[PDB]
């Protein structure tokens, strides 16, 4: 509807400017509506960002769910790679939303709780996979699985973000997936 | 001087409130001076934070330098643990400055460049140690050492921060050092 035009306008404008440099008038103009009509679809520009981020986060979540139900016929290293690649490709395809969404964590309770809920879910799933690998004898019982899963997921969040943002320092985007896979596989399977 | 009283006041107030909830008048009062006298020592409350953070960052840097020149007579795992412990104990003893300092990265060019410079230095040193371990045959040649060092240092920054802040999710502070050491040692020495 007009809602999709507002969202697409916001995502396009976030390529160039921070959210503080975008006005409600800018979003309405880009969507072909008046300022009061905008407020019928969203209560604020922050709510537009929250919706964009919610869509990106659930896109990753659903893709990870799909992988879980369709295990790829390949070795263990490639199975972890395909999982991390979900986050690499989903957030990497929406870099401006990812950037603005992490910035809004500091100021928005709703954004911070969205990130935290989905991080908790992904950590719990990671820990359950580690636990399953230990039970079948494929991985050694080293660190508590949930603590290991927490640090590896936090590593991914920080490292992918730095790569996408081109921060200094960062791992080049063309190298970050293999870097993370190496650290995940050695720390999960290494004695 | 009066400068130390301003700094100590700011660090005490940051335990309770964010920097946006602290006024120049608050710092001057706590230091026993007037507002115009404050501006003789610092141009802004942001400059007070920058100085606090610069002191914490150089405290860690100097401690790491000291360790480098006095290698401990212990095994490799404990040597890495003693190095990571520098960051665990230095920033962990100044949690309010660490919290406010990371928040200011978004808004202050000087704060962002302070963090980046010292992260680059620590990554380079980590990579040189990895390279030395590979040359003496103690570590396998897997990932490029500088890429591995980048991701492990970014992991530490994010994971220690979450632990200190009590974020959800996070590794409990009493467990985070052993968690990070495990990931560093397995990813550096694991084939
Ligand atoms: C901040 N940049 C965007 C961003 C990039 C990555 C992440 N991540 C943290 C949450 C889960 N995550 C992961 O590393 C999950 C790996 C999957 C989970 C199960 C098997 C393999 C990536 C979160 C945000
Ligand atoms: C954000 N929380 C405070 C904070 C905590 C940790 C860090 N770190 C990132 C920079 C270097 N760092 C490290 O993990 C360095 C490990 C040392 C370097 C050489 C041998 C072992 C910790 C940076 C900031």
Swiss-Prot record, chains A, B:
Asked if the keyword Protein biosynthesis belongs to this entry, the reply reads no
**In this entry, which stretches build a coiled coil?**
none
Which residue ranges hold the DNA-binding region?
23-42
Q: Does the record's keyword annotation contain Transcription regulation?
A: yes
List the SUPFAM superfamilies.
Answer: Homeodomain-like, Tetracyclin repressor-like, C-terminal domain
Q: Which InterPro entries match?
A: EthR_C (IPR049397), Homeodomain-like_sf (IPR009057), HTH-type_TetR-like_transc_reg (IPR050109), HTH_TetR (IPR001647), Tet_transcr_reg_TetR-rel_C_sf (IPR036271)
Q: Which domain of life is it from?
A: Bacteria
Q: Which UniProt keywords apply?
A: DNA-binding, Repressor, Transcription, Transcription regulation
UniProt-recorded Gene Ontology molecular function terms = DNA-binding transcription factor activity; transcription cis-regulatory region binding
Q: Which residues form the HTH tetR-type domain?
A: 1-60
Purpose: Involved in the repression of the monooxygenase EthA which is responsible of the formation of the active metabolite of ethionamide (ETH).
Record note on quaternary structure = Homodimer.
In Swiss-Prot or TrEMBL terms, this protein is called HTH-type transcriptional regulator EthR
């Amino acid at each position: 509807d007009r809602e999709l035009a507002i969202l697409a306008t916001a995502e396009n404008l976030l390529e160039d400017r921070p959210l503080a440099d975008i006005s409600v008038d800018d979003l309405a103009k880009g969507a072909g509506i008046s300022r009061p009509t905008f407020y019928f679809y969203f209560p604020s520009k922050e709510a537009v960002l929250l919706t964009l981020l919610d869509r990106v986060v659930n896109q990753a979540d659903m893709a990870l769910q799909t992988l879980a139900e369709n295990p790829a016929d390949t070795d263990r290293e490639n199975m972890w790679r395909t999982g991390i690649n979900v986050f690499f490709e989903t957030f990497g395809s929406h870099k401006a939303v990812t950037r603005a969404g992490q910035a809004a964590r500091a100021t928005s309770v709703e954004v911070a709780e969205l990130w935290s809920t989905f991080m908790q879910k992904w950590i719990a799933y990671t820990a359950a996979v580690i636990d399953a690998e230990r039970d079948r004898g494929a991985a050694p019982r080293t660190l508590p699985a949930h603590e290991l899963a927490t640090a590896l997921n936090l590593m991914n969040e920080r490292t992918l973000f730095a790569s996408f943002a081109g921060e200094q320092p960062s791992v080049p985007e063309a190298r970050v997936l293999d870097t993370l896979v190496h650290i995940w596989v050695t720390s999960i399977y290494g004695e």
